Amino acid sequence: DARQRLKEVEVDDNGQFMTTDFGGNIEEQFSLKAGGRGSTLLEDFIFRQKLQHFDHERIPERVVHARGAGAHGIFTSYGDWSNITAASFLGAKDKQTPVFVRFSTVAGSRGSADTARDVHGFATRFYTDEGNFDIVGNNIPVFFIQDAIRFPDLIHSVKPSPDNEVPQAATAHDSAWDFFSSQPSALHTLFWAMSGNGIPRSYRHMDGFGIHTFRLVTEDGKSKLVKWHWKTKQGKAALVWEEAQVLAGKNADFHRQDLWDAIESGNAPSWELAVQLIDEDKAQAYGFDLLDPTKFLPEEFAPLQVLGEMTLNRNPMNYFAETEQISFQPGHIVRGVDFTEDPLLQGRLYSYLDTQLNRHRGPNFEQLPINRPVSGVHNNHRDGQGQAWIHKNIHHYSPSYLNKGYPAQANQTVGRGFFTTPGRTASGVLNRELSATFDDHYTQPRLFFNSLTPVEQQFVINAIRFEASHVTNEQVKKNVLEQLNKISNDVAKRVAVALGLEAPQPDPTYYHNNVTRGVSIFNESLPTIATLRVGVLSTTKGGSLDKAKALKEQLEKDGLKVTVIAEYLASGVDQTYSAADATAFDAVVVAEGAERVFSGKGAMSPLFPAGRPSQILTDGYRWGKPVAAVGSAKKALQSIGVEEKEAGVYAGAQDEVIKGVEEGLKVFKFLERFAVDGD
């Protein structure tokens, strides 16, 4: 068990009388008053100690990635990688290292919607026997900016307007689009955010990326450039913006519940840890600088090499103490790994340590159960707000005769200490400039777009069309279209149409037809299901419930959790029609003999809002979800204009519906149900 180290700090209050924070049994339900109908007394210590705790419960949210969720896990190494890295969690076969991952959005505040369109976070803590190792990544391999100094500018621009604080968890506003049109480096991550990567189905159906180039140092000192990758065993799956908008309102904790449910149900999510190895001498050899966070390395130039697997088997016991309080830092490095001269990475090392003081009100944030390592801490650090420990060592300085030299210095040769790569050199003038090798901002965005399916590319343009239509400034819209035209003239002309402006001037400078693998979401098929969310639209009258229960049993057999929807909570009913919605499910199936409730008199029930069952079916189909009807249920599809056999849509008997709807999920989303330009 990964949570074993937290068992000593775990409190049970069952079978116990109410006490104050300083001990002693009490009754915290009545205030001390001066008489029967009298004023409350200052001498009521019980009231004050209870309310003081409550009044001071909240800590500041993270400056970015405020909205998110975590889970505990176990990382297992596939073999001894001592040849490539001196890391401890990697230099052994089948070595089990405890982990904790916190996935998140960006612009969104603490209460923002899980299904908002943003870059997603993928922060992973490795509780190594040689210290805490963090890979604070994102679901997109590229970042918006090239210099960390520009981070406040990017965040201030994407986040709500400073005058009214509108909008929440969105980039559809003047300020955000002014920055992208003024900082062309931001164009690659935009294309990724405008794609399926911006609105994924779940945290489990996400690929993770360390973004930066790092170094892997061997015992001897030989280094190799490295790129961290987290490949999902569940496969990449994404929603559609029209679905995503409804889900943000119907269930703002969509991803948060998706993860929680998976772990509890037994189907724990997995990720393979892959790397891209690059020689120090081939840092600019691939047509771009590897110190550039706006560019990613294609799989064709460097194949991915799997090092191990990380699975999340335990959910937290207290969201605050664990998920909210966890303080990640990319500066949480161990012997075997080292930084690169990536200007974005360089500034992050400072920022993450600094911010911790605001969020936690002191320096002992690493003493918190969720942050503390398993390796042990022996240093000269003393005092500070909320000191949890009592240091036996009175000679808290170095060098020293009195402490016989303890704690001792460790480096490369002795005590397995951390060391910077010996080959690393500083050369040239001290300056506040950026390398000329960082000047290309249009080639890489087009490589991604050219590597997506025709309907996927539309989704990218249908996100930009949506977002840009919110810009009130006419000049910002033109500035955006000028930048988009530099990537692709096709992309620019398609967006231009929705905006009412006409500015097509093909600039063939960065135009190319090159395609890269592993960037598409829907192109590959779903491996296991294991997804799942199947909604069964049934009714309380006509014995449809009994037929729906039979479908529920047979479908769950392949490792699923099917929810039966009816007018009220009968014998086999899990959700009602007023509580249920199409956003909650991936597959919508209408049970046999489900009325007359789709268009007849049965549609007008005081139990659910007018025309609800019909809406769940309508929504599913338009969102590309595989829809199904058993026997008589064909009239449900006909009431809106849906043909018997087309894409995912399958009719017939009981077993005839089960087989096919399962195949639909492998495709997940039916792209043929979406209008592409030129038709």
Added chain:
Amino acid sequence: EVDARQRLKEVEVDDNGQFMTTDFGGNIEEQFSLKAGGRGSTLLEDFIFRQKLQHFDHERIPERVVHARGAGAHGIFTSYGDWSNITAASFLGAKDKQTPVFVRFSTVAGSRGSADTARDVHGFATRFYTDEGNFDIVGNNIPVFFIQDAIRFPDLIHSVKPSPDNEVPQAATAHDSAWDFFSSQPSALHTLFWAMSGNGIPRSYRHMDGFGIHTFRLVTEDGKSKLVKWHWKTKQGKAALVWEEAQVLAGKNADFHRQDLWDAIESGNAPSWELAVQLIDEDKAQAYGFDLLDPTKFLPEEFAPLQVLGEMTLNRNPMNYFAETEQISFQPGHIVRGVDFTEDPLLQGRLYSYLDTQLNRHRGPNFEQLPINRPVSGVHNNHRDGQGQAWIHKNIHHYSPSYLNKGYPAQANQTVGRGFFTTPGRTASGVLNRELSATFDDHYTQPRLFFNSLTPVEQQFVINAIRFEASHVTNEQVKKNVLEQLNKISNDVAKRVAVALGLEAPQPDPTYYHNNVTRGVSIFNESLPTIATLRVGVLSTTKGGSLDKAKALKEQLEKDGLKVTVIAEYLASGVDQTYSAADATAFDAVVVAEGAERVFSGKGAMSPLFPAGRPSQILTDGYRWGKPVAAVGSAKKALQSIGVEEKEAGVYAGAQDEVIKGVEEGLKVFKFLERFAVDGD
């Protein structure tokens, strides 16, 4: 005539025409990090980077423990006359006396980023910048609170807020913990009925009635007191959404109420509220069938008519949400001479709590020195030092009594220096105890008086809310416990909810059953006194010259006071919003322009510009949500594609004379309750 934000001028910072500087002055370049070479590592000696990033890393302060999600506006309070006969207050001390105000509206369970249109109790908190100190009426949009003793506040909040294990759900009461508390604490049943009604999901902050909840005292110069109940009556009228609309709006626009207020002030149509009071004699505190020290019960208008004292209008929007709205620290303990507290156990514990919490949110005691918190009256006290002391105090003898400071600052009381004083008649009698009065024992009469005072359809919205919320409880015993409590209020309410849950509800308990009705509790009975600031959506098309006909409809409507948005495939000559960007939740009236029927049927519906079947959905949504729908000329085919009658109540068909005047009529009604199914058919 005057700017309500005049006092914040002193602190405004213009950066137009200025070069980038550090926090300690000096012109700088904050766009490139200092590196050791061309492709080198960043240097620690880069003070520019560190000072820029340090400020950014320390931008966030903790959100409010409750009422985290909300938005404010500056305003001017005007008195209708000289109320010296009823109160010694300065702001009520003269006719047409203008007192600067600042109101913050909010939810409760929702966090900083939560949706504005969620089902919660709404906050309504007013700061009066009196020439006699800051006076706060920290109230809600419901006249009654859930609990009777302030000591139980953490219990109520912990129960309604997200589960501690997973932090699910956000801004909702549809979960085991919240419904276990209501079934275990029957005092919570009145506010529940209010939260389950239209009061729980209002149309806007401007279409809300505000209540001070507690009973207070109004002290005259002489010392004579009168029990009082604060009320804020909206000049805009009470208007509420429907749950099915509210759920879609939370996703489509989570800043719905935040924008609604912002737009109103900018457009010129500033919101107004009349300040009304309920006067009660000290001796008649238990005379009305309930204790007036009870926050779970309200006083009916039939026993005590409302008396208007003045009017408050919000004419100025903030310049910086953080510095103003986020940083404002309200306290019901912000009292002035003329007003006094009552022995209300909920009020008593609030006075402590609100002052305490500021130390967490602001990390020090000088939170009152912040521009938004500072009074206009002037500050003279021996308070010194403290985190972030903004002032240089001139008096070196910071104590009392003192010979050296000549007795300054001097003590003020009732007779000298117009100081605050507690009501002289106020007495303490009896044993010191941890109990509650027997007069607080009734928790079922008042919930039933509210329910009996709602229209038949309104009553269904209460029923359905409970049906929706309770269906989320996973525990079978909690659902039974809830139905047992509901049965104590009304057997009809209990049996209707029971149906949705699958479990029957025994057994009629006629103890607190009555057919009494009270006025001014219904949201949907009375029609809106004005139609301004009401959004209307015009569904038009780029083909067939429909745009030109839509612009004509937009012109005649905008001159009435309404805010008109023309929806089409792309942003043409007169297009404000596209079909992919627009939704029915954004508007109060949905009108289909002549020649727009083309995007309802055939290939017109299948466009790469908007999602499949969008125009139809906006029209479908508007009708099912009870919004007045309209069609000009041939646009009758649009209504026919879903099954809507042109002569139905709320539906308008004809010309660009009949629609324009016919729609604006339906807006006065706001929501057509006839389209909603009631039990018994």
